[PDB]
Design a protein around this nucleic acid. Sequence first.
DNA 1: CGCTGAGAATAGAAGTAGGAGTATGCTTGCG
Length: 703
Amino acid sequence: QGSCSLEGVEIKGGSFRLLQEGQALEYVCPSGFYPYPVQTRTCRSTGSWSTLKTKTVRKAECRAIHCPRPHDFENGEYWPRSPYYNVSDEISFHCYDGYTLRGSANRTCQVNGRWSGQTAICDNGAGYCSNPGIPIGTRKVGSQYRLEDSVTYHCSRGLTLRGSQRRTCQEGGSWSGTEPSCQDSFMYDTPQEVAEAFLSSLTETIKRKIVLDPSGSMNIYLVLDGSDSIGASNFTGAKKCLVNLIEKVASYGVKPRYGLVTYATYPKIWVKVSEADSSNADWVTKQLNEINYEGTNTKKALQAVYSMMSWPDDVPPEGWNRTRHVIILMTDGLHNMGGDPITVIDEIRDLLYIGKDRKNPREDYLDVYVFGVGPLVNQVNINALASKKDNEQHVFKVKDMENLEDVFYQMIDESQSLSLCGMVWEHRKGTDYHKQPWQAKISVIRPSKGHESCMGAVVSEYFVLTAAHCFTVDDKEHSIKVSVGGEKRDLEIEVVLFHPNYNINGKKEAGIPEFYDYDVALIKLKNKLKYGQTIRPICLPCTEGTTRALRLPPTTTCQQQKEELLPAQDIKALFVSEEEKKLTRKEVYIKNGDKKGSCERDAQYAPGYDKVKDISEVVTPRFLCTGGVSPYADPNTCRGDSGGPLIVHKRSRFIQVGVISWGVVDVCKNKQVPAHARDFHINLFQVLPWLKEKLQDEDLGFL
DNA sequence: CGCTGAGAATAGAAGTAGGAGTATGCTTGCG
């Protein structure tokens, strides 16, 4: 229908994107922030846009995210106690007299409005089943843990319950359903979390494995809502996703029967499990890469899956009770019109003889996974379809189709090697240096300026990349100490190579104190580095490793790597910061499009630069600029964050594109901060001949 | 202290129901 005028829709410190032909819009705020008061708006029939209520508000804003308070914690206490918690605010748990603690007892408010770790529980053994516990933000009704006794979970107002709201103590000692969590609107899952939580609970860990039966079979059904952003560009993204899924599942030594269904308003059936080539994984891949477009109706798709399941024999066929069925549904809408599709799932469970017995519940033989995309997905409908298994997650909500691609890219990258550059598998029990293995702390002691706390990046087994200003020639080799993997041992240096075109003494008798052009250095370690779960390399530009990370053909020029890593835009980069021995990822944006000159124009204020006529004499083509308050409130760098990598996070891999060099104003531990507070980084594409010459013998396969 | 038969309300029909609703969830005016 008609559209609305976009005058005044912008949000303080955020951006927006129009969905469904402009009749809707989502607000996107920087990390750690959320749009206040609401995330989405609709186009009225009166020209204007939806109003903002909390109580009508003038204009939207981005405000900091708070982590919920534990509504209660049975058989123990937690502290510090507060009504709400800011980001990066840990809380500890203690259990009462004679109780036993399980779960993470030192949780922490992550940058995503969620608590780090998992649910703390105090239990003794005075019940048949275990203490199901109270996930933070929920409310459990019922405290008796005898057989068949129930417990129910409730979410606060304005929040949506993902998981089970009723768990019954089954015969056994394990609870039914799955642990619930409360979901706010803007809450998205990261591709890392989705990949891990899908792989686990698709598999069991011996590496992993898929547990079929003796003379067992698996039937997998890929259902795609191609009536919106999923079926765009002829399902181009969803094709990659499913190709990598088929590959990764074939890697586990199983030959499953595949089925493939798209649906806009009608279900279109491409691959049926009865076709003899339905277990030929590459036949399925060839037929999948062959799908085409062309109101969303899901019940018909689930009934097509049911027709695949059903049999026309007299009565049953052979091995019906040995086959395990998996239904992977990817949607971005799912306003369940055309009927109520839950009945279809219950008919399916009927047909599989699931939940019709006490010693044979057969819940292992049906898995339903749902991947929701975008803000317009119904958090309740997707959760009602998905399954609920103890210690397993089956519902996911991601923000783009790009993130859904990165999910399966990350899943494929899982078991390549420890030498895969820029690879981080986000685990269940991970510390700081688990998530930034390339980091290297340089310490240089000399009380003329001061304990220079410089970071670094492990680009290979013998080399570490940093910034040249960290060192001088007065600094002698018994004063530079490099540490990796966040250990206590310092490493041994052969030589520290500075760029041949580096000179901080400028341009000194021209009236400029420091000239940071070509401010890169390479530390050659004497010994070798032992790649592990805490020491791993980072990807560099214009190497075939980055070409394989960016999922590109081997005939890719360094210029194409540039135009994908550094286009003329507001590229979303990141870096890592020292914060009380905490390693946190600060996320910034590189002003390389139309804001580039506005960024370089804010160099004037930096020390000794307030009278330089030409600002391009201190800010040279070997610099990228981040910081400021446009288009988002960027975080600035610290004095000790100097030399660290400026990372671009793409296709679930981390590519280094810059070296942190200098900043306009040092405001590090802060938060009224100026808008001319920018940071400059050395572009690693501009110092490429030096890097290639110096790392020629490190197996980086430079382009 | 009684009718409300028409509108509001983050959209917004049109019934009339102390309805409903993707983050929530109602009242006009008449002694």
